[PDB]
Design a protein around this ligand. Structure first.
Ligand code: HEM
Ligand SMILES: [Ca+2]
Ligand SMILES: [Ca+2]
Length: 306
């Protein structure tokens, strides 16, 4: 099974190399940490964290990069290539892309001001990509709470704490206007904005995302601290200021009897949130991994070794 010390003998400096790469990238692109965490999440929700999302097209299988939840959204692939190259130089054919991305996600969270911990390691890389599975498994911003719960349970995360804590990943990063247009102007064919969206914030968002405007324009997930990893995400939800439907559903859904207290607990205490986030992150990181001699230690994260 996975262990945090997997590379302590074979590549003791892997975490440091990953950190250095992100630190350097953050200077030119302050959004990279958020982007990397999102990559790990979308890796894990499709056949487990096996770096299948990093694979490019082949004539035998399509890339997950063209999934509805990844196309024109997922980013940072070149950055992963960079750290992988650096790590391959430090320790040839040792660290899997799956593990590398997991470490990158944790380091990204820490660099953004979040908790610091050692992630379990020992994952191996997939021998194929799963586009159809990605389209079926990746949750969408328009999901209701029951659908969000179903999506998490589908991949192995049964706990509402998993859902509420991991959703905290939206404490930083960007979101396209495209995904909230319904909430702002015509929610569920009601001809009205989403009633669970704070009316003052509604005005602000309408100004950033006017009807018939640029749907690709970006908006911050957390209006309090856009680039800092903290519990402000939950404080927002309590005030009906979650950006996308799936965020606000955690606090306002008729099915939120179990998630409301979790949202409050995380909003009330940074420690409680950070603790739950690490716990949920490691559980997500433990979703159907390839281990031992299963799969490979991919040399180029974009292609299967031949
Ligand atoms: C619970 C269901 C979730 C849904 C429906 C969802 C949906 C989305 C959507 C619509 C975007 C905007 C993409 C774009 O406009 O390009 C996004 C971005 C992001 N998500 Fe999620 N997400 C969910 C869970 C999570 C989880 C579990 C994490 C990680 C622990 C996460 C981390 C992120 C980050 C950091 C970004 C910003 C990435 C960037 O700015 O490059 N999300 N998410
Ligand atoms: Ca995967
Ligand atoms: Ca924040």
């Amino acid at each position: 099974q996975l262990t945090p010390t997997f590379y302590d003998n074979s590549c003791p400096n892997v975490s440091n190399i990953v950190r250095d790469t992100i630190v350097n990238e953050l200077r030119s692109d302050p959004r990279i940490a958020a982007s990397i965490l999102r990559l790990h999440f979308h890796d894990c929700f499709v056949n487990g964290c096996d770096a299948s999302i990093l694979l490019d097209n082949t004539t035998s299988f399509r890339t997950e990069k063209d999934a509805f939840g990844n196309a024109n959204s997922a980013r940072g692939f070149p950055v992963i290539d960079r750290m992988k190259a650096a790590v391959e130089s430090a320790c040839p054919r040792t660290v899997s892309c799956a593990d590398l991305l997991t470490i990158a996600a944790q380091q990204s969270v820490t660099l953004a001001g979040g908790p610091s911990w050692r992630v379990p390691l020992g994952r191996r890389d997939s021998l194929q990509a799963f586009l159809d599975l990605a389209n079926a498994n990746l949750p969408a911003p328009f999901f209701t709470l029951p659908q969000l719960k179903d999506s998490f349970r589908n991949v192995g995360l049964n706990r509402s704490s998993d859902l509420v804590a991991l959703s905290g990943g939206h404490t930083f990063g960007k979101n396209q206007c495209r995904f909230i247009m319904d909430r702002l102007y015509n929610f569920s064919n009601t001809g009205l904005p989403d009633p669970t969206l704070n009316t003052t914030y509604l005005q602000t968002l309408r100004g950033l995302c006017p009807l018939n405007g640029n749907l690709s324009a970006l908006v911050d997930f957390d209006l309090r601290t856009p680039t800092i990893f903290d519990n402000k995400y939950y404080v927002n939800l309590e005030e009906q200021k979650g950006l996308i439907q799936s965020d606000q559903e955690l606090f306002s859904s008729p099915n939120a009897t179990d998630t409301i207290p979790l949202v409050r607990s995380f909003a009330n205490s940074t420690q409680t949130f950070f603790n739950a986030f690490v716990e949920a992150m490691d559980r997500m990181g433990n979703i159907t991994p390839l281990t031992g001699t299963q799969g490979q230690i991919r040399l180029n994260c974009r292609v299967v070794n031949s």
